[PDB]
Amino acid sequence: DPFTMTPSEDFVVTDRGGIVENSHRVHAAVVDAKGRLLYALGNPTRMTLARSAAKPAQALAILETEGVAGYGFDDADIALMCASHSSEDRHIARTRAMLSKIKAEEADLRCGGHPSLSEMVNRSWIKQDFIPTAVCSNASGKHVGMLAGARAIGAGTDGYHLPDHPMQGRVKRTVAELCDLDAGDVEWGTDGCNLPTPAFPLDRLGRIYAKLASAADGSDAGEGQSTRCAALAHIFRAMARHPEMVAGEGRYCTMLMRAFDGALVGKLGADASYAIGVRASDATRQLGTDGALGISVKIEDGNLEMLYAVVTELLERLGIGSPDVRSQLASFHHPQRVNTMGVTTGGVSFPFKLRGVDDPRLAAVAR
Amino acid sequence: SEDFVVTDRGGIVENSHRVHAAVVDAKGRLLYALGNPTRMTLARSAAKPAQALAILETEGVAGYGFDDADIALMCASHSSEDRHIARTRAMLSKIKAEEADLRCGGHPSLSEMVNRSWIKQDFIPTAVCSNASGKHVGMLAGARAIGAGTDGYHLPDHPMQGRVKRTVAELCDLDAGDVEWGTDGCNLPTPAFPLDRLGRIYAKLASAADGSDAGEGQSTRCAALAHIFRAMARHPEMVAGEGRYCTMLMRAFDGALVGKLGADASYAIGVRASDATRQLGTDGALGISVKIEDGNLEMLYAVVTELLERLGIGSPDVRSQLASFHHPQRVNTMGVTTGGVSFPFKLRGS
Ligand SMILES: [Cl-]
């Protein structure tokens, strides 16, 4: 029944010859630069672990730490602080160059190695029995930034990754401030990279990225800015100008940001969250706002392949970009469903309904 | 009906996965359920024992001399270990066939350890490495056995697939039109039917083994089902491989049950009559089928193991061999425990 559809029915679905294979629940929030909710899928206020989608907020805490500007981190360095990188040799090299700028060493890192987020990098590692170490962590840039912050204020580097350290105190305050939430409304776990990681309603993730894009807009216009807005503009610029540092070759975040050529930034969170900050454009205006836009997505069951398909479909439905811009992501949008003999056996479809002509008696129960 | 398995990071919900499950008696009557026990579901590799039945029921196939390990391979989603490839080639030799006659393709190994070995050695898997290579060799065997020709053995209009289609519905006790069909990863037709009927197949496998073991006047079909159960339980390493859930499950239970994975996170178990099954209020064998709605295998194995615990199937000791699947490790790159898995669902009885 098309006239009683509900958020509980917002799915991305795979089929095999028309027969349902898997289905995945979708949550999404589209917010303006003050966080007002414009469009939604599923439960746009789902309490959600941001994971690496929080990294631009953590980078802001680092950049607002007094004395860090003296280290001479450049834009590509800041993009690495914002990264879940593929552990390509260029990311490892930049991590070592950042350690040298702050006079630290790999032994000071409290993140650990892991299989590369790139299958092609990981294939090279397997061929040489290479065991990844702390410096190959996808989060290595954030960790060097955190060491830099710790050294800059005289706190000392041991323990920089623990909640009681002033660097983590700065992070926690900064996250809650960008979300416009009280401390008690942000929850904290421990991340795979061994730092505190926040959880907050999904729409507030979109709000953070709308603030990133809004600051970029104010910077490009030559508006006076607070030190925080200037730094947010710097983070947006770094990510958009060095998207290979934020992920790597063949990675969704890198291909998405290169396709849009400065119009937006986007960032993955583990277990299938995504956030995009969209600069003010004709597209955003047609969606009903005068400023920048934020988009946040969570696939309830954590499937990454579905996340990238859904994010790309959502950009298409919001009219963000052109068909030629978004066609660079066609392989993510409609993932291949081909068997071991080259036969196409199925595909992906998007039975969700953006909400933002319905009878007023149709309840939209966030689910 | 709102039955989930949930992972958390420090008590904070990370992911949740919808679970469907059917526990049936030997005649398929529903005894316990999670979610939607009649969910229309692609059985994928969990259908392979029924495809093995079609092969073994083909006239002339017994003349090839397949043994219980070969039949176990027909029923398998093997890890493509060297020993699976070797048995595949041995089975081709028994029917005087060539790897070039197989119509399945190579794929990255279902064992990441095997796959890593392949990567290190620049190995490109071919048809004989397919996890379903035993099924395809059996299909070639049945095609040759009735003189139908190996050409096109995997196509729906070939009599071997006609036999498979008919056998799947007969075992489900469904009319042909109630089973839907697509194309599998291994390039054969693959069936979809309500989830509880997958449990029904496996209860019939275990029931047949109980009847064989009991000296009961069986048809040739029940005798073949009994043989299929015996081959899987005696050679579980062929059905999956070292470290695989199916192999470890069947080894732990030492003949009391067979279990089989289906791609995109289905699972089927046939349980022979036991103190545990009588405790569940049935005087015969039992079948269990499970589907994780979003396709996550890690959650599948954890749920199945929890389900065996809730049903009292096995002893705590026997199930503890599966502890690493039951509560998956949730540790970060520095050895800190960051989370865990919870099972807020409740079995509903009849
Ligand atoms: Cl260094």
Residue numbers in the entry:
A (entry chain B): -3 to 352, 357 to 367
B (entry chain A): 4 to 353
What does the original paper state about this entry?
Asparaginases (EC 3.5.1.1), which split L-asparagine to L-aspartate and ammonia, are grouped into three unrelated structural classes: Class 1 (bacterial-type), Class 2 (plant-type), and Class 3 (Rhizobium etli-type). The conspicuous catalytic center of the enzyme comprises two Ser-Lys tandems (Ser48-Lys51 and Ser80-Lys263), centered around the curiously hydrated Ser48 residue and located in the close vicinity of the metal binding site.
The crystal structure of this mutant revealed that the absence of Cys135 caused small structural rearrangements in the active site area, almost identical in the two subunits of the dimer, and triggered a collapse of the metal coordination site, since the mutant protein was unable to bind the Zn2+ cation. These water molecules form strong hydrogen bonds with the Ser48 Oγ atom, with O…O distances in the range of 2.4–2.7 Å. The pattern of H-bonds at the two lysine residues from the Ser-Lys tandems, Lys51 and Lys263, is roughly the same as in the WT protein. Only one conformer of Asp187 is visible in the electron density maps, with one of its Oδ atoms forming an H-bond to the Nε atom of Arg47. Interestingly, the side chain of Cys249 does not carry its typical chemical modification, which may be linked to the absence of the Zn2+ cation in the protein structure. The structures of the C135A and C189A mutants demonstrate that alanine substitution of the cysteine residues involved in zinc coordination led to collapse of the metal binding site and abrogation of the L-asparaginase activity.
